[PDB]
Design a protein around this ligand. Sequence first.
Ligand SMILES: [Zn+2]
Length: 580
Amino acid sequence: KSEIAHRFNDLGEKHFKGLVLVAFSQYLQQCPFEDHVKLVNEVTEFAKKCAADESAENCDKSLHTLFGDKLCTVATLRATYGELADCCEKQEPERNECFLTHKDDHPNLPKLKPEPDAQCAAFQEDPDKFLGKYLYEVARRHPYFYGPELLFHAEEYKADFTECCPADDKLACLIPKLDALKERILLSSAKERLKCSSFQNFGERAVKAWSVARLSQKFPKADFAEVSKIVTDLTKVHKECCHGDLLECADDRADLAKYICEHQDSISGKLKACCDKPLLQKSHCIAEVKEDDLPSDLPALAADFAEDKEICKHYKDAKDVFLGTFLYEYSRRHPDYSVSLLLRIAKTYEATLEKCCAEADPPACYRTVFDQFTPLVEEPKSLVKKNCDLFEEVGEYDFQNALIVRYTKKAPQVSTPTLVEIGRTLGKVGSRCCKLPESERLPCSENHLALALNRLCVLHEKTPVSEKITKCCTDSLAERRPCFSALELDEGYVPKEFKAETFTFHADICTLPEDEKQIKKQSALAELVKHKPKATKEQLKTVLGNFSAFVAKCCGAEDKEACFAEEGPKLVASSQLALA
Ligand SMILES: [Zn+2]
């Protein structure tokens, strides 16, 4: 009878309030913490009152109706949120689509700078407030964050503080832990955003093909029915989270974990560790679980997908099912391939059938279909060996610099902060993937590149500046990384006029932590490319090295600002000449 009462009962007050706080924090990203808390309470009160009597007036209403209504009660709505006040005129489901349109993927709130001393205070004083504030701060910065997973990270955040606040040195215990968690948040946010972006820009079909590939690699022991079952269920979970249906998303996610763990012997040997854990840890562990050992009994695939003389009938009758089976089969056999590569391979398999079956003798045509994959494997394997050999020679910073030069040339109309963010992210892929066992690099590299390129595309949706970026972002999800890689210098771009202040440093840089020092330098590097787009990466590397030396010198000076004042302009003048 009442969906809100039902969900409150399934989920419990703690998680219910957690998810509702996250939901409201993502839709309304500028509201102060105390405004959202009270909205959560009001809605939770309504749920308890409905749970007492489901036939009561308004308890029949949908979750979108009840949450949307509550968000539209908020004080100073039209002033703080001009556009969302317009959404409040509309009824559901129109109102929710409108809300979703207005989520801000670049809110530009301050960095969460961890103050161990002042935070341990607030955690001791009121943990429910302090833990709650963490949900709100992370969620508003990442408005598409996977809600149940954010409740999970809040539990790690609680645990870091529980361990580190009683200790003598708060910083040395806590800082490395909070730094690790911020990295995990970044990555996880980027994973969920790609899933939402796929729904948005390519629909549920692409989300399913993607999931079939990955889950098949993860669970090669599972049969096509079990894989299909989990994909269907997992797809509905993320469709709900991305659509904002956060309570439904959490409940269906718990259910799927239960199913998976009930059939763990069938699905995968690696689940045993995951399935002996509390529910949030459980689901997290399943989502991140290592791929299973390859089964000895895997079938030869030529006979069904190449030699069978009735493939054109199977393909014509049940295109969706037949190709699904191919993708499942090929992917469970290839955990050494990236997901995108498998989806390129699947598309090539389909293309080979479309062509061969329209022609007189299809069996002779499609007999060589597996051999059309060989070329597609080479291009990404070289790209990874090439960029891993560079990473290992030069290290993270210079690698990031290579990538910032490379992407700024591809899209010099993009804002410097975006180019710097993406280049840095693309460069962290080296630190994550190149150290790994050699079979794991390709999937790791390409999978993490997909996350970073989606971030570029998501920002480009907001602030479109480049026809080239648009095409790569919108054409084909699978072809996206190869499309980007194939861009050379944009030669319709007009060199940005030189502005001395852009390349002018002052002694303020010297106090900054190292990562922020690099960002300034890297920002100047992006600006160098925009000014001199035809300059080779090797010229730019030399000029930036001269800037770094200059900076290192004047930071080490007695009269720091007099050094920047005299030495700075000289280097600015001669920097122009080395880029011609
Ligand atoms: Zn919905």
